[PDB]
Design a protein around this ligand. Structure first.
Ligand SMILES: CCCCCCCCCCCCCCCCCC(=O)OC[C@H](COP(=O)([O-])OCC(O)COP(=O)([O-])OC[C@@H](COC(=O)CCCCCCCCCCCCCCCCC)OC(=O)CCCCCCCCCCCCCCCCC)OC(=O)CCCCCCCCCCCCCCCCC
Ligand SMILES: CCCCCCCCCCCCCCCCCC(=O)OC[C@H](COP(=O)([O-])OCC(O)COP(=O)([O-])OC[C@@H](COC(=O)CCCCCCCCCCCCCCCCC)OC(=O)CCCCCCCCCCCCCCCCC)OC(=O)CCCCCCCCCCCCCCCCC
Ligand SMILES: CCCCCCCCCCCCCCCCCC(=O)OC[C@H](COP(=O)([O-])OCC(O)COP(=O)([O-])OC[C@@H](COC(=O)CCCCCCCCCCCCCCCCC)OC(=O)CCCCCCCCCCCCCCCCC)OC(=O)CCCCCCCCCCCCCCCCC
Ligand SMILES: CCCCCCCCCCCCCCCCC[C@@H](O)O[C@H](CO[C@H](O)CCCCCCCCCCCCCCC)COP(=O)(O)OCC[N+](C)(C)C
Ligand SMILES: CCCCCCCC/C=C/CCCCCCCC(=O)OC[C@H](COP(=O)(O)OCCN)OC(=O)CCCCCCC/C=C/CCCCCCCC
Ligand SMILES: CCCCCCCC/C=C\CCCCCCCC(=O)OC[C@H](COP(=O)(O)OCCN)OC(=O)CCCCCCC/C=C\CCCCCCCC
Ligand SMILES: CCCCCCCC/C=C\CCCCCCCC(=O)OC[C@H](COP(=O)(O)OCCN)OC(=O)CCCCCCC/C=C\CCCCCCCC
Ligand SMILES: CCCCCCCC/C=C\CCCCCCCC(=O)OC[C@H](COP(=O)(O)OCCN)OC(=O)CCCCCCC/C=C\CCCCCCCC
Ligand SMILES: CCCCCCCCCCCCCCCCCC(=O)OC[C@H](COP(=O)(O)OCCN)OC(=O)CCCCCCCCCCCCCCCCC
Lengths: 459, 174, 99, 603, 56
């Protein structure tokens, strides 16, 4: 993994030693090169993982997430260079440094082989994100959003640290391979219930679970565009990856302890879709759609079948790409009219045609439209939930109907109708914005073409 | 065709009736088939002849990897990590092979249904029974292990099944 | 007023100075080369080359190997009258049940 | 190799070809619509060839060309089913689409985005072909949702029209309920059969159960606009007339009927689901014809006629006659497409007027559209030897001669009478009498494109039924023996509807005025279903979306419980701890208390 | 001139040399885990006449 880790730690001095007008060019070029290099991790084995060394390993679950992170960095660079034109050179370099540090921490998190190193890295990811939000947010509410995000994550994760050190003391190791091979059943006791609770609650807060999700609209709406892109695409996937990793040692207690979380996930999926139906803010609508999709992922992980894990992985990758694209589109609209209200700008199809096309494709991917990997993951999760019980189909159908409703509501509100008469500063779409949308959308279709790369180790 | 094994993928002998026309009207199907053979089949055949001639000049071979058998989780001692690793890898490979066996049987079933057409309920009874037996065995082997399945869990399931069978036999003999 | 504060500046349009602007940089040459490097590297290199690399990634998952092994096992078992799928994963003789 | 598979896949691929040319100078020029129409005609002939291959020896095949992915023991591959249904419906759909595209070349000449319009029509055709030829449930669902989204895009063709946007979203909503049913069926089939392909589904489901068959029925009702999910089809007239003619009425609303046809072995194995299908079809056809007989918008009348014919198809499926339903699908496609084209010609010639109260005099004003619409209405009502005779008459005979629901049979007969009634209404109010349109007469139907497209769909409305019925192999036992009065029942009820509707329409000329009846108000306002069911449930869902989930729970109580209460407690404790006057006497008294407590209570 | 180009574009080798150094360190880490090389029951075999190790 060092062949990918070291180039990021070299992106840092390159950023700090490049000229004032070349930082964006150099960062974008070398981020794309690092993504291409990280594309070689997809060649996985059918029996076991890729164990590079004692510290890092790669799997069919880690590889797509690493490729997604490395691909997401240059898009964030493009959006940031869009909205940071008047910044000073030092502060531009500091923002790029925060993005580079976040990518490095995410890579090491996804490839960490021990649970304690994984904990350290996935908690280290908070500092760059908090700095980015509370420093380069546009509105006043960025401070409150950062406080909510930080304290939700930490109040979730500290019992996880205590549980991890306790598990190391009890079993002798936190190495994932050892704990998978030497796993023993978890007896029904209060102590085991609370250990299960500590681990699962940490990752549920990271997911987020319904009832533990207010920090998500707070942070996603108030973060800058790059922060919004990284928060939805990758940082929400740390919880799912962790749950798919820790649940090895949590059996058979997961059969009985998963009921409240499954009920919360399903009902809150319905409730957050309904909330999306009545959102006066576009960023909030995108954030709540993210909440619903991650609730579906939680359902998959909790039912915990080989068909559910593949759907969970595919849905995580698809949601990352789609949510990043939606945030980018909404940010272009915001950079036009300097307001996040959905009904402020209308007729954007007659004012900007190709952006209307990008909106249409993004909305069609947001709802499960076959044969997109979004639909692949959602359908696998729905089939696994059907095998689990036969009213989950009722809940999933309701959620799909509401998802289509609010996605097309957003599309029709923003793009169709007649333009606002007094808004006369909507310049034609930039080549940079069009390229950002194309780079968001084409890999999703190629993944649709080749779907076994994002179905996880259970494939 | 020698591409696949006729025993692994059986095909009933093909019985095609001879044409027995009763009218002097020409056959548009025959005329269009002649046109198709003249215009498409001959050009594609010539192109494939050239391509195969190019392939024959650079003949090279690839091989099927052979894995020797290794001791399984039953023979492995407790917390003997190396033996457990080898046994788990072997169990995973066998699981994949069994999945592909079930796939082969299902392909047989689908092909026979399509082939027999309107008489499939009777003529495909042989392929339905093989599928029933294969699926029963595969389900008994790997039915409800979970997302974190392993050779240890499958062995525990087999032990539980053996205990149930022993108890049933004892109760029957009692 | 309560402070000596700057007025809120007017929004800056990149197309006013440079009609053929790609939206990357104020400087025309820098903006053009930013567009060129982004398009070339991203689209051509990453998309095309990574897509064909992933398409032609070697069969390290042993899907075709498993299919050939299954073909051999089915042939052998149906030739000798043995069941196609064995009843047990392990050997009951090697398994020792409690009394 | 057999040319069958090659020619079928070639038809599909050459259909997909012009979409690749949508990024070219030809797409930037004015020759793109003619290019697409020519491609569709060539595809029609190339699909006619395998139809000849089937009608000779009954050749049927499945083609699994490309393997997609293997979910352990389940293999998903790109497979096509080229059987009787596919090889018969493909040429009919291609012929209809060719005629519609020529009619649109004439009709949509003033549209700035005629090239995009033709691209969307071709994309819908491709998705419908995918749906028809799909061999497994996943590919069938691909075609399902593809035609759904293409319908959504084409209904909202004029993006500035709020009514068009509402109609498109309404169609999406009802089709999403249908998709709930579809996904239920897919999940059940995979879980209980380890397959998504028709071969293994048919093999393993010897007695198919209520849950999968009701899922299929719900999907079919949603896609075919049966009662309960019907209103989106008449509302789908917001799109341009070519869209209404090709997509909805002829080829896309028959998607649910086709889905039920494709699982006819399972439908045979079940009986309760067959009864449910029969009752749903009967109520649908009766209610939609009853609503049709009193509409003043010609497109609305034709849409309700299409809904009634779909209900008749569902009735045919419910009596275990799957092949008659397919025959009626073909015949109805022909004559309903021609009827929609005639109504569109009338609308264009009268300056975008769609009101029969403003039409009139067109019998002699527009000769060729008049004769075409008369022939289509005679075929629609089952003229004893036209294209609609070879399907509707057999359907009625099968309904009368079977062990059916008595109410379903009665409603089917009344629906046939009302079909005659609304056809008479259209003819009487659009062609007979004196003009009622504005004085500036711009009537001109002398365009070769329009004339030739209507001609091609007119030869089918007369002869295609005879050819198709005499060339397909016998797939059902005929009802040879029956009473003479039951044999003539369809004709008798058709003539009675003709006569009663003609008399009622003739009474309009009297200088007599009377306020409308309650039955008239119920029929004209669509049974009040769209009003109540589009205002009450929508209001309640949108009100709960904000009052309860958004404000009460998300913004109030989820904030009050976890984060706000903890912050309040921490602030109170912080104030309590830090609120000290800094007096050494006070905190040294505290020291004394602490020392005493440590000495006594700790041992 | 040429000096200014090198003075400005010398940062474009940092990421490539970091990739090279990462590959080298990956090789170094791999060479420390050679305690079961040609010793697994599955892949144990006899060495060819002109080779010292099975893998590196
Ligand atoms: C108050 C009403 C109430 O109890 O609502 C429960 C209900 C859970 O859903 P459910 O479907 O009713 O529960 C299924 C069974 O009743 C209960 O499940 P079971 O009977 O199968 O046994 C499993 C049970 C085992 O039972 C126990 O362990 C009981 C002993 C106490 C455990 C306390 C754990 C606390 C963990 C942190 C919670 C932070 C909040 O597991 C739990 O109790 C899980 C505790 C964590 C639940 C989710 C935490 C996040 C809540 C987000 C909204 C917060 C506002 O709602 C909540 O817990 C949150 C809303 C109410 C506060
Ligand atoms: C992939 C295409 C991505 C296009 C991105 C935008 C490109 C662009 O700027 O275009 C402007 C450019 C010129 O237009 P313009 O007037 O200069 O620009 C102004 C406006 O932008 C003009 O805007 P517009 O209104 O003309 O929009 C053009 C087009 C632009 O939008 C799109 O093309 C959207 C396509 C993505 C939809 C996302 C949701 C579904 C995800 C499915 C993923 C499948 C991946 C397959 C592999 C892909 C590998 C890249 O949008 C539409 O046509 C409306 C949406 C139609 C979607 C229909 C999908 C049904 C399901 C198809 C499943 C096929 C695979 C399974 C088949 C199984 C059975 C064999 O147009 C093109 O270059 C043509 C674009 C593509 C035409 C539609 C293709 C739909 C997808 C294929 C369906 C099957 C038909 C046969 C295809 C044979 C090849
Ligand atoms: C909860 C109930 C659930 C019921 C479920 C079952 C429903 C079954 C429905 C059956 C069909 C009903 C058709 C009429 C309803 C629509 C009337 C309407 O609005 O027309 C205006 C509309 C004209 O629109 P417009 O140009 O705006 O004119 C404005 C109006 O003039 C403005 O003037 P208006 O507003 O005065 O016009 C309406 C007025 C004038 O329309 C008529 O009189 C239509 C009469 C149609 C024929 C009925 C007698 C058929 C006799 C057949 C005898 C032979 C049988 C065969 C055997 C022969 C050998 C023995 O109609 C009435 O007053 C009642 C008509 C009958 C209603 C039936 C449903 C009853 C609902 C509950 C009771 C309500 C009673 C009080 C009414 C409300 C409060 C005041 O009429 C038409 O376009 C023609 C209508 C269709 C005529 C032919 C119908 C043939 C099929 C039905 C008869 C059965 C034939 C055999 C079938 C096969 C048997 C085996
Ligand atoms: C009718 C409607 C049909 C419309 C379809 C439109 C598409 C055209 C047809 C498909 C293209 C022809 C088939 C090409 C196909 O064969 O290639 C695919 C392969 O596609 C690529 O693998 C997709 C690449 C996806 C990854 C792109 C990464 C680029 C950077 C993006 C980073 C972000 C990703 C984050 C998550 C990883 C499938 O793999 P495979 O069939 O076997 O290839 C055969 C060759 N073999 C036999 C040697 C194997
Ligand atoms: C299985 C779960 C789903 C079950 C049904 C749930 C119903 C929930 C209703 C959806 C909530 C609506 C949220 C927002 C939707 C879009 C906004 C909206 O209200 O659009 C209104 C729009 C415009 O009305 P117009 O008539 O065109 O008037 C226009 C005049 N210029 O109308 C609509 O599209 C709303 C239609 C919703 C129908 C609700 C009831 C549907 C009937 C379901 C029960 C029947 C089941 C069928 C049984 C099948 C038998 C096998
Ligand atoms: C015996 C064990 C219990 C002892 C205490 C355990 C602590 C549990 C975790 C504590 C989290 C720390 C956050 C609370 C800090 C105190 C907040 C406070 O004082 O409330 C007032 C404060 C406003 O005043 P100031 O910002 O200080 O400035 C005012 C200017 N005139 O309210 C706020 O807006 C701050 C809110 C902070 C973020 C909101 C809390 C985040 C979520 C809390 C629960 C975590 C969920 C777990 C998942
Ligand atoms: C106020 C009420 C607060 C209720 C929530 C609980 C949080 C307060 C933490 C205080 C600890 C309360 C639970 C203590 C459980 C415990 O210590 O035992 C677990 C067990 C003890 O076993 P032994 O000591 O070895 O016994 C040997 C038997 N012969 O040790 C473990 O398994 C490690 C568990 C770590 C402690 C977990 C405590 C928290 C429980 C999970 C809740 C997660 C909340 C996440 C916050 C996000 C939403 C707010
Ligand atoms: C373009 C014109 C090129 C001009 C020369 C024509 C080339 C002809 C020679 C044939 C090419 C060689 C070839 O086809 O090899 C087979 C090759 C791979 O072999 P497989 O057995 O399928 O491997 C399994 C992959 N998992 O197959 C292919 O690449 C052809 C695939 C084309 C089929 C259509 C592409 C599908 C696109 C739709 C998107 C996905 C839809 C999802 C399907 C859902 C099914 C439930
Ligand atoms: C609150 C009570 C009702 C709860 C379910 C409905 C909730 C609201 C609507 C949800 C719509 C989406 C989900 C639809 C699920 C349909 C499931 C189904 O059809 O179940 C059939 C049921 C079980 O049949 P099964 O067990 O397969 O066969 C043995 C004989 N019972 O067989 C039976 O039940 C026998 C009766 C057959 C008729 C059932 C009609 C169901 C209509 C569903 C759509 C409604 C709109």
């Amino acid at each position: 993994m060092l062949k990918i880790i070291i180039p990021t730690t070299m992106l840092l001095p390159m950023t700090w030693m490049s000229k004032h007008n070349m930082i964006w060019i150099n960062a974008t070029v070398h981020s794309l090169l690092i993504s291409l290099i990280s594309l070689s991790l997809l060649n996985q084995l059918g029996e076991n993982s890729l164990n590079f060394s004692l510290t890092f390993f790669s799997d069919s679950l880690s590889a797509p997430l690493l490729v997604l992170t490395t691909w997401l960095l240059p898009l964030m660079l493009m959006a940031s260079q869009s909205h940071l034109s008047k910044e000073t050179t030092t502060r531009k370099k500091l923002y790029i440094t925060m993005l580079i540090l976040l990518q490095l921490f995410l890579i090491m998190t996804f490839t960490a082989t021990e649970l304690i190193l994984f904990y350290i890295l996935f908690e280290a990811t908070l500092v760059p994100t908090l700095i980015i939000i509370t420093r380069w947010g546009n509105q006043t509410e960025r401070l409150n959003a950062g406080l909510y995000f930080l304290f939700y994550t930490l109040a979730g994760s500290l019992p996880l640290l205590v549980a991890l050190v306790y598990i190391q003391n009890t079993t002798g190791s936190l190495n994932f391979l050892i704990i998978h091979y030497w796993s023993h059943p978890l007896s029904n006791s209060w102590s085991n219930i609370f250990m299960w609770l500590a681990c699962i609650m940490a990752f549920m807060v990271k997911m987020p679970l319904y009832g533990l999700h207010l920090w998500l609209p707070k942070a996603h709406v108030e973060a800058p565009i790059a922060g919004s892109m990284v928060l939805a695409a990758v940082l929400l996937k740390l919880g799912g990856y962790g749950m798919m990793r820790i649940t090895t040692i949590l059996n058979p207690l997961t059969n009985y302890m998963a009921y409240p979380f499954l009920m919360l996930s399903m009902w809150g999926m319905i409730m957050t879709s309904s909330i999306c139906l009545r959102q006066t803010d576009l960023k909030s609508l995108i954030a709540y759609s993210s909440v619903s999709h991650m609730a579906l992922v939680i359902v998959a992980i909790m039912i915990q079948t080989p068909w559910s894990f593949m759907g969970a992985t595919a849905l995580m990758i698809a949601h990352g790409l789609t949510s990043s694209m939606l945030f980018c589109l909404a940010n272009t609209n915001y950079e036009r009219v300097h307001s996040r209200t959905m009904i402020l700008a209308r007729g954007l199809q007659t004012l900007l045609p190709l952006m209307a096309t990008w909106w249409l494709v993004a909305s069609l991917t947001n709802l499960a439209l076959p044969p997109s990997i979004n639909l692949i993951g959602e359908l696998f999760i729905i089939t696994a939930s059907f095998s689990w019980s036969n009213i989950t189909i009722i809940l999933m159908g309701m959620n799909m109907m509401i998802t289509a409703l609010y996605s097309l509501y957003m599309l029709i509100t923003t793009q169709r109708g007649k333009y606002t008469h007094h808004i006369n500063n909507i310049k034609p779409s930039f080549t940079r914005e069009n390229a950002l949308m194309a780079l968001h959308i084409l890999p999703l279709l190629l993944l649709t073409l080749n779907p076994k790369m994002i179905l996880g180790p259970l494939y | 065709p020698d591409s696949w094994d006729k025993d692994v993928y059986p095909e009933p002998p093909r019985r095609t009736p001879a044409p027995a026309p009763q009218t002097s009207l020409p056959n548009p199907v025959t005329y269009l088939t002649k046109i198709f053979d003249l215009l498409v089949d001959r050009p594609v055949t010539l192109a494939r002849e050239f391509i195969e001639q190019q392939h024959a000049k650079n003949r090279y071979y690839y091989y099927h990897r052979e894995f020797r058998r290794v001791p399984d989780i039953t023979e492995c001692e407790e917390k003997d990590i190396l033996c457990m690793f080898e046994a788990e890898m072997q169990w995973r490979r066998d699981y994949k092979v069994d999945q592909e066996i079930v796939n082969i049987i299902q392909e047989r079933l689908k092909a026979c249904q399509q082939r027999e057409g309107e008489s499939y309920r009777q003529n495909c009874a042989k392929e339905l029974e093989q599928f029933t037996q294969v699926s029963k065995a595969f389900q008994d082997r790997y039915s409800d292990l979970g997302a974190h399945y392993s050779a240890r869990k499958c062995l525990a399931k087999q032990k539980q099944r053996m205990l149930a069978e022993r108890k049933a036999a004892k109760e029957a003999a009692a | 007023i309560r402070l000596q504060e700057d007025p809120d500046p007017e929004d800056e349009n990149l197309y006013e100075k440079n009609p053929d602007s790609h939206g990357y940089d104020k400087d025309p040459i820098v903006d053009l080369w930013n567009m060129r490097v982004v398009f070339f590297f991203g689209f051509s290199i990453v998309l095309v080359l990574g897509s064909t690399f992933v398409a032609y990634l070697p069969d390290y998952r042993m899907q075709e190997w498993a299919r050939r092994e299954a073909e051999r096992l089915v042939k052998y078992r149906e030739a000798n009258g043995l069941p196609l799928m064995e009843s047990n994963c392990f050997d009951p003789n090697k398994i020792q049940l409690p009394e | 190799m057999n040319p069958f598979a090659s020619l079928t896949l070639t038809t599909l691929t050459i259909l997909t070809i012009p979409i690749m040319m949508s990024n070219s100078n030809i797409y930037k020029t004015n020759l793109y619509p003619n290019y697409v129409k020519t491609t569709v005609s060539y595809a029609f002939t190339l699909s006619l060839v395998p139809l000849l291959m089937f009608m000779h020896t009954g050749q049927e095949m499945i083609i699994s060309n490309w393997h997609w992915m293997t979910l352990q023991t389940v293999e998903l591959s790109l497979s096509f089913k080229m059987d009787y249904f596919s090889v018969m419906f493909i040429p009919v759909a291609l012929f209809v689409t060719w005629s519609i595209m020529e009619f649109s070349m004439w009709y949509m000449h003033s549209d700035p985005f005629i090239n995009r319009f033709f691209k969307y029509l071709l994309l819908f055709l491709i998705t419908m072909m995918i749906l028809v030829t799909a061999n497994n449930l996943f590919q069938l669902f691909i075609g399902w949702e593809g035609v759904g989204i293409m319908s959504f895009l084409l209904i909202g063709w004029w993006h500035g029209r709020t009514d068009a946007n509402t109609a498109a979203l309404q169609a999406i909503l009802y089709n999403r309920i249908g998709d709930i049913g579809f996904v239920l069926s897919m999940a059940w089939f995979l879980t209980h059969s380890n397959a998504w392909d028709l071969q293994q589904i048919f093999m393993l489901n010897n007695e198919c159960p209520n849950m999968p068959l009701i899922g299929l029925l719900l999907a079919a009702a949603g896609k075919s606009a049966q009662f309960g999910l019907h209103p989106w089809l008449p509302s789908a007239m917001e799109g341009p007339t070519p869209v209404s003619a090709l997509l909805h009425s002829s080829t896309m609303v028959v998607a649910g009927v086709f889905l039920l046809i494709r699982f006819y072995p399972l439908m045979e194995t079940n009986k309760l689901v067959q009864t449910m299908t029969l009752c749903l079809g009967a109520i649908t056809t009766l209610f939609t014809a009853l609503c049709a007989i009193t509409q003043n918008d010609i497109k609305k009348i034709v849409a309700f006629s299409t809904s009634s014919q779909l209900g008749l198809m569902m009735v045919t499926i419910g009596i275990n006659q799957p092949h008659l339903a397919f025959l009626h699908i073909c015949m109805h496609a022909f004559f309903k497409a021609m009827l929609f084209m005639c109504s569109g010609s009338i609308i264009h010639s009268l300056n975008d007027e769609q009101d029969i109260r403003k039409m009139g005099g067109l019998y002699k004003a527009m000769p060729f559209t008049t004769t075409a619409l008369i022939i289509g209405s005679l075929a629609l009502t089952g003229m004893p030897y036209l294209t609609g005779f070879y399907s509707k008459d057999l359907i009625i005979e099968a309904v009368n001669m079977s062990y059916t629901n008595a109410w379903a049979l009665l409603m089917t007969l009344i629906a046939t009478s009302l079909t005659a009634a609304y056809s008479t209404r259209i003819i009487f109010f659009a062609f007979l009498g004196k003009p009622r349109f504005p004085p500036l007469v711009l009537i001109n139907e002398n365009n070769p494109l329009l004339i030739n497209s209507i001609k091609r769909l007119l030869i089918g409305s007369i002869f295609a039924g005879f050819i198709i019925s005499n060339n397909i192999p016998p797939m059902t036992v005929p009802n040879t023996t029956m009473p003479l009065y039951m044999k003539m029942t369809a004709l008798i009820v058709t003539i009675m509807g003709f006569m009663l509707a003609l008399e009622l329409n003739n009474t309009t000329y009297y200088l007599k005025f009377k306020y409308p009846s309650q039955t008239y108000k119920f029929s004209n306002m669509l049974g009040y279903y769209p009003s109540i069911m589009h205002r009450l449930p929508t209001y309640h869902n949108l009100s709960m979306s904000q009052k309860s989930a958004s404000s009460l729970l998300d913004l109030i109580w989820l904030e009050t419980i976890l984060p706000k209460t903890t912050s309040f407690i921490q602030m109170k404790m912080s104030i309590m701890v830090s609120n000290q006057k800094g007096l050494i006497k006070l905190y040294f008294l505290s020291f004394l208390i602490t020392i005493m407590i440590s000495m006594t209570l700790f041992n | 001139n040429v000096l200014q180009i090198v003075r400005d574009h010398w940062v474009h080798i940092l990421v490539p040399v970091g990739f090279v150094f990462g590959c080298y360190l990956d090789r170094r880490s791999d060479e420390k885990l050679t305690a079961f090389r040609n010793k697994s029951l599955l892949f144990k075999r006899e060495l060819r006449p002109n080779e010292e190790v099975t893998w590196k």
